PDB file of C-alpha atoms in Angstrom:
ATOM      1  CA  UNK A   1     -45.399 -38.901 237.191  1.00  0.00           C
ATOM      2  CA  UNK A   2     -42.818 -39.488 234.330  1.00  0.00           C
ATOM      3  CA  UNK A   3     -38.739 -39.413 234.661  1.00  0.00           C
ATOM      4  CA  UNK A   4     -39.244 -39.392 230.580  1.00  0.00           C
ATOM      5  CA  UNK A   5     -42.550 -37.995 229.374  1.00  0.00           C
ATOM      6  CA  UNK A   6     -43.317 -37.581 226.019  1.00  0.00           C
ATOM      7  CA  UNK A   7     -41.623 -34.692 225.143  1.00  0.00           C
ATOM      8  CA  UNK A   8     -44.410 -32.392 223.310  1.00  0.00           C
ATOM      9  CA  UNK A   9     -43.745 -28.728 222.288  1.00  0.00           C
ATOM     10  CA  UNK A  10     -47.111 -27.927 224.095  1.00  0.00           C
ATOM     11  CA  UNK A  11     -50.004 -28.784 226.466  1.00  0.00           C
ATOM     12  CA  UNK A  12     -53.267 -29.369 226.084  1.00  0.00           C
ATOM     13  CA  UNK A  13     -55.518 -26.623 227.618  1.00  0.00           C
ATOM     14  CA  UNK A  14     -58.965 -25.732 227.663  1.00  0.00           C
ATOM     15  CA  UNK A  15     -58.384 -23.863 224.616  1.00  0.00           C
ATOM     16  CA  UNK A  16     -57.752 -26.848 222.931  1.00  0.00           C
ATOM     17  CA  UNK A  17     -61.654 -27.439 223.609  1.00  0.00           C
ATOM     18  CA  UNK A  18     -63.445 -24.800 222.125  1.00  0.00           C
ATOM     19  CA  UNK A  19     -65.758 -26.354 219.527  1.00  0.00           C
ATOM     20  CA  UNK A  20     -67.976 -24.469 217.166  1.00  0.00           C
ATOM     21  CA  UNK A  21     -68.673 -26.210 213.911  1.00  0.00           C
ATOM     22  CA  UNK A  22     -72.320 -27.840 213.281  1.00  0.00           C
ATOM     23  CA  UNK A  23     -70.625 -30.918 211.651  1.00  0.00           C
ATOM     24  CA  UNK A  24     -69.515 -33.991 213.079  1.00  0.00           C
ATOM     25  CA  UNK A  25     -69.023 -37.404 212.000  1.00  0.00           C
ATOM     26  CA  UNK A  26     -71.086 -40.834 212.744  1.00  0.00           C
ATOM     27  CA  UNK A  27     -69.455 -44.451 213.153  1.00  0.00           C
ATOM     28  CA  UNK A  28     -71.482 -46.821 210.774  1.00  0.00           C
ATOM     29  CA  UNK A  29     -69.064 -49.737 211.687  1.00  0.00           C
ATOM     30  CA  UNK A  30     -65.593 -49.066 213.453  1.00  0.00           C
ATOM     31  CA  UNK A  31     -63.951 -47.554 210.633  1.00  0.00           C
ATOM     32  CA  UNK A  32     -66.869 -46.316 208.764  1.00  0.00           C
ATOM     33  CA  UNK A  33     -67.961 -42.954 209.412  1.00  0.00           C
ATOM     34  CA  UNK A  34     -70.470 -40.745 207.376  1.00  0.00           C
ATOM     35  CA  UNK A  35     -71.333 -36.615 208.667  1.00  0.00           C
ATOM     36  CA  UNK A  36     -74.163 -35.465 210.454  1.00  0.00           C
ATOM     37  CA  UNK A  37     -75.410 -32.368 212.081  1.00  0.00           C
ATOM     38  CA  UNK A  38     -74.951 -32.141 215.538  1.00  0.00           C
ATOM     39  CA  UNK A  39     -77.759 -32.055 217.456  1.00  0.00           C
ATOM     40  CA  UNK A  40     -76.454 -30.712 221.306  1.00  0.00           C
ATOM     41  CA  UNK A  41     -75.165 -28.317 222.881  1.00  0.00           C
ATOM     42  CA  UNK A  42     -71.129 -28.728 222.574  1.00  0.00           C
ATOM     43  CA  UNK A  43     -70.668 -25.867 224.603  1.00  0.00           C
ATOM     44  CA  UNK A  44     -71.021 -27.332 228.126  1.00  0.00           C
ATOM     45  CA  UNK A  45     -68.018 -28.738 229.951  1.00  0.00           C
ATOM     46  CA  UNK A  46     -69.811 -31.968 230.402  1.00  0.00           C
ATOM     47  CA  UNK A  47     -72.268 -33.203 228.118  1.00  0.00           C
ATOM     48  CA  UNK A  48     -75.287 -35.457 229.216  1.00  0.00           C
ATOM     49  CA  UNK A  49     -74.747 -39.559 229.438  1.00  0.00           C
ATOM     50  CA  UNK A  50     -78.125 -40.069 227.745  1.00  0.00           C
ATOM     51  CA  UNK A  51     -77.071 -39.328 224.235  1.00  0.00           C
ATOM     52  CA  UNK A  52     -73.724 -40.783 221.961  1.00  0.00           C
ATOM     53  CA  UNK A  53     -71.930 -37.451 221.015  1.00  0.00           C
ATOM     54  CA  UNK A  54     -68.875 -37.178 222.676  1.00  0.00           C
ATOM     55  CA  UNK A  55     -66.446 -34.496 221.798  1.00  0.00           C
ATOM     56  CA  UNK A  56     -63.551 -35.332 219.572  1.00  0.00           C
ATOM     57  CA  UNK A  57     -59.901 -33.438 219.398  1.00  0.00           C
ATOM     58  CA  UNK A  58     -57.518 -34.197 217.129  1.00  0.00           C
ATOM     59  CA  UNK A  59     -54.119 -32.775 217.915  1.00  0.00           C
ATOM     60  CA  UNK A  60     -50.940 -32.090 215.584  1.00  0.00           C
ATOM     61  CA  UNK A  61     -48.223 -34.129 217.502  1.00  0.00           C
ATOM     62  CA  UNK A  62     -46.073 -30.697 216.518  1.00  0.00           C
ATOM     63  CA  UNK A  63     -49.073 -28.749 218.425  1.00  0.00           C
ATOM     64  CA  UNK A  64     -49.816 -26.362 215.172  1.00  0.00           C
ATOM     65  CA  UNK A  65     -53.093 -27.936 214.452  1.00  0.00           C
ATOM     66  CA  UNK A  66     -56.336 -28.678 216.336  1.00  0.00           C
ATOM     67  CA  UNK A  67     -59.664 -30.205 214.938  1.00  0.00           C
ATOM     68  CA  UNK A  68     -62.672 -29.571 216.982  1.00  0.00           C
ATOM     69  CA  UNK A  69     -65.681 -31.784 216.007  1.00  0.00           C
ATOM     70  CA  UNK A  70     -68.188 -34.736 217.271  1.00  0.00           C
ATOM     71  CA  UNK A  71     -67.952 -38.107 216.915  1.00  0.00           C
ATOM     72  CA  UNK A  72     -71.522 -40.106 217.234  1.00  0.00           C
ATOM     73  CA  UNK A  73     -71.614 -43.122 218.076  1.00  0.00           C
ATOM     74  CA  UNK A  74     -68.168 -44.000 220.152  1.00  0.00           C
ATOM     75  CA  UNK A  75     -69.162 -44.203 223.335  1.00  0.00           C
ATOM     76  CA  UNK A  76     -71.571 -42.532 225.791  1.00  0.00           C
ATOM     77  CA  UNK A  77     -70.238 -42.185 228.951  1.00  0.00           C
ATOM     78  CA  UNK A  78     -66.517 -42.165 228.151  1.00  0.00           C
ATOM     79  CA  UNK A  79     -65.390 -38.787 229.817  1.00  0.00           C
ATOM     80  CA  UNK A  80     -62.054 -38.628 228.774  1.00  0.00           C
ATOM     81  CA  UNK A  81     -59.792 -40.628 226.109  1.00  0.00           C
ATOM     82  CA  UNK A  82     -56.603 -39.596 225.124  1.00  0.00           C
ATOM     83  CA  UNK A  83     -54.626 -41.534 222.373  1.00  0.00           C
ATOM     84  CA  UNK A  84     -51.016 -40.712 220.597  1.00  0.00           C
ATOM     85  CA  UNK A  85     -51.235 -44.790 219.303  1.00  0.00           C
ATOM     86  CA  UNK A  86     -51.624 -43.304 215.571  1.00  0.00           C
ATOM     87  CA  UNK A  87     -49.212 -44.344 212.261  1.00  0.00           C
ATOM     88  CA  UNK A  88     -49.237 -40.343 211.933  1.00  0.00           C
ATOM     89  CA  UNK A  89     -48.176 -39.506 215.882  1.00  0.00           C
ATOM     90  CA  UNK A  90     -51.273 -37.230 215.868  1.00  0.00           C
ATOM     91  CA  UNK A  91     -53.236 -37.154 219.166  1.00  0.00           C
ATOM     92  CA  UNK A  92     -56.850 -38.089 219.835  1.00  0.00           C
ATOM     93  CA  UNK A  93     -59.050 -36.997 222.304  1.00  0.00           C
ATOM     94  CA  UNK A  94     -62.762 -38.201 222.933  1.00  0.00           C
ATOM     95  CA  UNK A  95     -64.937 -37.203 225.943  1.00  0.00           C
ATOM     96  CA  UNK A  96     -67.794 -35.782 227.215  1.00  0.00           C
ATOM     97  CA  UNK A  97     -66.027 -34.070 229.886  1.00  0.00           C
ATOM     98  CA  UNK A  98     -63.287 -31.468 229.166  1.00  0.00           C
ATOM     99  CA  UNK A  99     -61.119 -31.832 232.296  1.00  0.00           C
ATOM    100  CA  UNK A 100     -61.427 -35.559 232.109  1.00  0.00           C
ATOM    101  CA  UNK A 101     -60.090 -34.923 228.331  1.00  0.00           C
ATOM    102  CA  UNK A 102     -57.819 -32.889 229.555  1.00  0.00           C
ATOM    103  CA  UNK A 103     -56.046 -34.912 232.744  1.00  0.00           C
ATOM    104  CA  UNK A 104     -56.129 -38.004 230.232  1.00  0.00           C
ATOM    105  CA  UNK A 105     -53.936 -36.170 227.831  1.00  0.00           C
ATOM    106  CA  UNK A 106     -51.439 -34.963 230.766  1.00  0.00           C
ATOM    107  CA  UNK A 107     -51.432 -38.371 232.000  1.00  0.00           C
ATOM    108  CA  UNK A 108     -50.848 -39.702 228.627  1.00  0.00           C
ATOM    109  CA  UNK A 109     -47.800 -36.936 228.121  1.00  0.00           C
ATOM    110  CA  UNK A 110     -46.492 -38.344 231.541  1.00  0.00           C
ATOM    111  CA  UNK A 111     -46.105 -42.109 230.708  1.00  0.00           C
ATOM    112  CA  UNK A 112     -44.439 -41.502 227.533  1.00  0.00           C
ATOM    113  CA  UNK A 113     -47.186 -41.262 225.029  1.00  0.00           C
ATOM    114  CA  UNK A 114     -50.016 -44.168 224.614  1.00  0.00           C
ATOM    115  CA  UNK A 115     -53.646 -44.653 225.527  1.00  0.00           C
ATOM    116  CA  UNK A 116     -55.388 -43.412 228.573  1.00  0.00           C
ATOM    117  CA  UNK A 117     -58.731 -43.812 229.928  1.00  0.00           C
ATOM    118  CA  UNK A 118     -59.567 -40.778 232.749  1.00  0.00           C
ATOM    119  CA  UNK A 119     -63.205 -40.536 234.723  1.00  0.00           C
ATOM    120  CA  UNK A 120     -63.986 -38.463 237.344  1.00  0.00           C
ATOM    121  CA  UNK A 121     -60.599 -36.571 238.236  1.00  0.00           C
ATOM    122  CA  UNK A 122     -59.017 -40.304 238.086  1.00  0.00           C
ATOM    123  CA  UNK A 123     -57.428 -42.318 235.591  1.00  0.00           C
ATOM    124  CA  UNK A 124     -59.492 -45.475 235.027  1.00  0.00           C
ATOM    125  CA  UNK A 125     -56.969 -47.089 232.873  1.00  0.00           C
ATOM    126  CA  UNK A 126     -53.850 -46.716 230.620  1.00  0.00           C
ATOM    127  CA  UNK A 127     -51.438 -48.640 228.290  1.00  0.00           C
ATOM    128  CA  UNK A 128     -48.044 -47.315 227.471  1.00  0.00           C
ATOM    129  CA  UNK A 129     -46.993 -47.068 223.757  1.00  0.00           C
ATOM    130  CA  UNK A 130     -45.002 -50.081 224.446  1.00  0.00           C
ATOM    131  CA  UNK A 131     -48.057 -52.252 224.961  1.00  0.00           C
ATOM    132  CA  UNK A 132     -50.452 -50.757 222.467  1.00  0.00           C
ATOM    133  CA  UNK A 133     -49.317 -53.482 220.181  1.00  0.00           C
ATOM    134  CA  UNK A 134     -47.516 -56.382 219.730  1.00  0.00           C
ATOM    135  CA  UNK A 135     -43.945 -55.371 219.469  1.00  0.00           C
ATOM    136  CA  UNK A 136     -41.875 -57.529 221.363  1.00  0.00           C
ATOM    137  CA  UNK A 137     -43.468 -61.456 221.806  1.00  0.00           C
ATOM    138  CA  UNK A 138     -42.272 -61.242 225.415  1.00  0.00           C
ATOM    139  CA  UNK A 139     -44.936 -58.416 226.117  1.00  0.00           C
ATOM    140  CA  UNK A 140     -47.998 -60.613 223.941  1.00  0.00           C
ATOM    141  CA  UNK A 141     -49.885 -61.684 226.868  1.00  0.00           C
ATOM    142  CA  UNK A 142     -49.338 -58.231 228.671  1.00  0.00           C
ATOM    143  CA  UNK A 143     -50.606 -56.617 224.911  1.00  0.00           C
ATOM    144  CA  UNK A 144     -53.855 -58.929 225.231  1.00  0.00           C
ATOM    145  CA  UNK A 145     -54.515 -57.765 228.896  1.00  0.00           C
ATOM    146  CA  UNK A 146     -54.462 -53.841 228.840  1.00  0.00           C
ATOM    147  CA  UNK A 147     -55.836 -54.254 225.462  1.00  0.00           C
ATOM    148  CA  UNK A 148     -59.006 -56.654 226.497  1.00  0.00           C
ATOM    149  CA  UNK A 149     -59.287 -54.656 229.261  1.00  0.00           C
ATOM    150  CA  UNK A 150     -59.269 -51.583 227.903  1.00  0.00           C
ATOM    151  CA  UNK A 151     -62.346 -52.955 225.127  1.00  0.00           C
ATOM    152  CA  UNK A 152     -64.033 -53.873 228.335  1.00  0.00           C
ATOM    153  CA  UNK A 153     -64.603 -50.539 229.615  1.00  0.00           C
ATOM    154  CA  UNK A 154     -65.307 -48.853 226.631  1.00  0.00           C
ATOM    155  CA  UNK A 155     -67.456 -51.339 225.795  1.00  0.00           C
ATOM    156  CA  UNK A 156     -69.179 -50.470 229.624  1.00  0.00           C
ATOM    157  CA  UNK A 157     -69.614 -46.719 228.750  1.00  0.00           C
ATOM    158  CA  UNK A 158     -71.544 -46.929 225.070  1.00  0.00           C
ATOM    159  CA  UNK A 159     -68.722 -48.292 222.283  1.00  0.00           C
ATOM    160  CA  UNK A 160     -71.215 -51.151 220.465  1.00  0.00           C
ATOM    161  CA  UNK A 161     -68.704 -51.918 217.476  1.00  0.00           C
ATOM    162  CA  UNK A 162     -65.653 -54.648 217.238  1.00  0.00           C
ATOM    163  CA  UNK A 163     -62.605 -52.674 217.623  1.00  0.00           C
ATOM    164  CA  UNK A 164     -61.800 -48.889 218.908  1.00  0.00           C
ATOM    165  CA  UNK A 165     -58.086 -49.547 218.277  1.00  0.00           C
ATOM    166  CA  UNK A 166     -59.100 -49.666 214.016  1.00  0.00           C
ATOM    167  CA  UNK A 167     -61.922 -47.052 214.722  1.00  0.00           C
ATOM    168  CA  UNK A 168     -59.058 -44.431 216.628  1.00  0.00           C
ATOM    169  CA  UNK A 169     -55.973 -45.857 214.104  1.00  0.00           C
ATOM    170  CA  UNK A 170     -58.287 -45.003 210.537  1.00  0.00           C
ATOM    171  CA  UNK A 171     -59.775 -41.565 211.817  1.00  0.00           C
ATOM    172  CA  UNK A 172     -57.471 -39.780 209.210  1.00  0.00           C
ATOM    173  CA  UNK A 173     -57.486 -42.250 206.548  1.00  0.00           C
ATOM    174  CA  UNK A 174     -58.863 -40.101 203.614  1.00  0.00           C
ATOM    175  CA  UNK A 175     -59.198 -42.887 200.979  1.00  0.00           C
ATOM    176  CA  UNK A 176     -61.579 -44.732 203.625  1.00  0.00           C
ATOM    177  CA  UNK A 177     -65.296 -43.161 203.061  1.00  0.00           C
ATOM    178  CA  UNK A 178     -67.253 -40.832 203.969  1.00  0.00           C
ATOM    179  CA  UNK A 179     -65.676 -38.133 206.249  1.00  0.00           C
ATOM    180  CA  UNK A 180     -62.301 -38.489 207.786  1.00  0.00           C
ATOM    181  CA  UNK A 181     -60.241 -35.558 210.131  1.00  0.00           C
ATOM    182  CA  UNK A 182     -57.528 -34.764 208.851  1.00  0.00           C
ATOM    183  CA  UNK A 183     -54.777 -31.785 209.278  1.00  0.00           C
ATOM    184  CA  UNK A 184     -56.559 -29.158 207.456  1.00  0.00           C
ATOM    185  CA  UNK A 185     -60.096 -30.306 209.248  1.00  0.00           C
ATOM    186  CA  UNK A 186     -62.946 -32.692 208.453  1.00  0.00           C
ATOM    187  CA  UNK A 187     -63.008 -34.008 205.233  1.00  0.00           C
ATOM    188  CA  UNK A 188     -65.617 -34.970 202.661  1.00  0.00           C
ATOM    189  CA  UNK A 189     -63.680 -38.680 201.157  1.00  0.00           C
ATOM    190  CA  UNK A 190     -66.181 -38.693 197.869  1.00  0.00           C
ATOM    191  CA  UNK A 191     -66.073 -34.567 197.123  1.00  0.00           C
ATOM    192  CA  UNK A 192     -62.505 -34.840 197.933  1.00  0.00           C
ATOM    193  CA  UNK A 193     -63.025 -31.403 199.737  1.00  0.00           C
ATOM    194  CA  UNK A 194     -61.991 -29.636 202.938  1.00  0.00           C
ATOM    195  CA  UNK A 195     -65.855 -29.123 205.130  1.00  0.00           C
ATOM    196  CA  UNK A 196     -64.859 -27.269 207.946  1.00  0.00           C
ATOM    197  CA  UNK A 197     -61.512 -26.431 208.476  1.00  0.00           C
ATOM    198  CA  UNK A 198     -58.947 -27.025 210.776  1.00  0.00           C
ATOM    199  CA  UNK A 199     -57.573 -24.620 213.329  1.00  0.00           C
ATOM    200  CA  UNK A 200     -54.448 -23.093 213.930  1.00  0.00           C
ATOM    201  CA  UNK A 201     -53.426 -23.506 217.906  1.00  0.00           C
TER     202      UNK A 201
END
């Protein structure tokens, strides 16, 4: 457990993964994402390892907001991955199982916000904010390791491109084309539009 968890005004429930627009978007590099129709069902609490749609949450770090859409192309047998490492504090979650979603974002709440990797009821791996970058040269080495290792088993379940850390850190980057997620829900960079809209927890 945690003698100081991040102290969020909420958790994350099953609520929290109820998805129900058609829309999602597709890596074309790590940053690079374009939308597609999704082609599933994204009503099942675990989705099938022999496609690369995983669920994807994204979570006002003042729990107001949620974002329920698909991400194609991350990963295909990540069940649950929780982030809070964002320049906004916002919270990502990617999975194609809901209570492996939801354990990794408990388990990230308990060690004080950060990155968490959850399979199977377990947590496979995690990195406290402390060492999801480089902020202290003391920690470099320790940086590298949960870092390299973390790239390791993502790239194991289905993630084919150079870098999740950019991919998860420019998700709401709205000058970065073609779709982005954003507080007021997926977001068309060229029309400059809201597509389907956020939701209010």
């Amino acid at each position: 457990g945690g003698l100081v968890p991040l102290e969020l005004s909420y958790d994350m429930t099953m609520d929290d993964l109820q998805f129900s627009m058609p829309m999602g978007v597709k890596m074309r590099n790590a940053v690079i994402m374009e939308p597609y129709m999704i082609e599933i069902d994204n009503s099942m609490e675990q989705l099938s390892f022999d496609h690369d749609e995983s669920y994807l949450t994204m979570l006002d770090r003042h729990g107001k907001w949620r974002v329920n859409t698909m991400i194609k192309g991350f990963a295909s047998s990540v069940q649950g991955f929780v982030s809070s490492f964002t320049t906004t504090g916002d919270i990502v979650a990617i999975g194609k199982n809901k209570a492996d979603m939801l354990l990794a974002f408990a388990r990230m709440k308990e060690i004080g916000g950060g990155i968490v990797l959850a399979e199977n009821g377990n947590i496979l791996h995690e990195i406290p904010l402390a060492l999801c970058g480089c902020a202290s040269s003391e920690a470099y080495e320790d940086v590298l390791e949960k870092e390299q290792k973390l790239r390791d088993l993502l790239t194991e379940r289905g993630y084919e491109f150079c870098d999740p850390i950019y991919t998860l850190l420019f998700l709401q980057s709205t000058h970065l084309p073609y779709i982005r997620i954003t507080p007021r829900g997926i977001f068309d960079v060229m029309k400059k539009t809201v597509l389907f809209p956020s939701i209010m927890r």
